[PDB]
Design a protein around this nucleic acid. Structure first.
Lengths: 61, 62
DNA sequence: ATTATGACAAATGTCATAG
DNA sequence: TCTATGACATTTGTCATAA
């Protein structure tokens, strides 16, 4: 779960809900992350891996 | 913080307390992950990045 | 479709102590 | 030394809403 790649997804123009549906992570968590209420560091490795996989599968394209 | 590399440090012969001093993480969590009372998935990215950085440094020795 | 805030059960980090 | 167990304040993930 590279912090930089997850950071790219969160800073992407992709919708918070749209990222959430594909990642499987809650839109709530994505919104609170982008806005600032939650920290990426406190995220469960399981959730972090999902975000990293979604962003990497896009970078190769 | 690749799950596989952290899984490798957990499976290592290094003492739970030895890894804790070097990583800054608590012996409690490492011991509980090894015991299996704690899931690696439920760990924070902050703490896992620390255990990951340790393993990568050990990997350089090969 | 999208955006925000919660509630809640169940964890976690960071400290101990106990064996 | 080492592991094991827990306390506690805080934060999660899940599952909602309301706009």
């Amino acid at each position: 779960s590279m912090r930089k790649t997850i950071e790219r997804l969160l800073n992407s123009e992709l919708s918070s809900n749209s990222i959430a549906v594909r990642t499987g992570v809650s839109q709530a968590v994505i919104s609170k992350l982008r806005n600032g209420k939650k920290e990426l560091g406190n995220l469960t490795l399981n959730s972090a891996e999902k975000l990293f996989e979604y962003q990497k599968e896009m970078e190769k394209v």
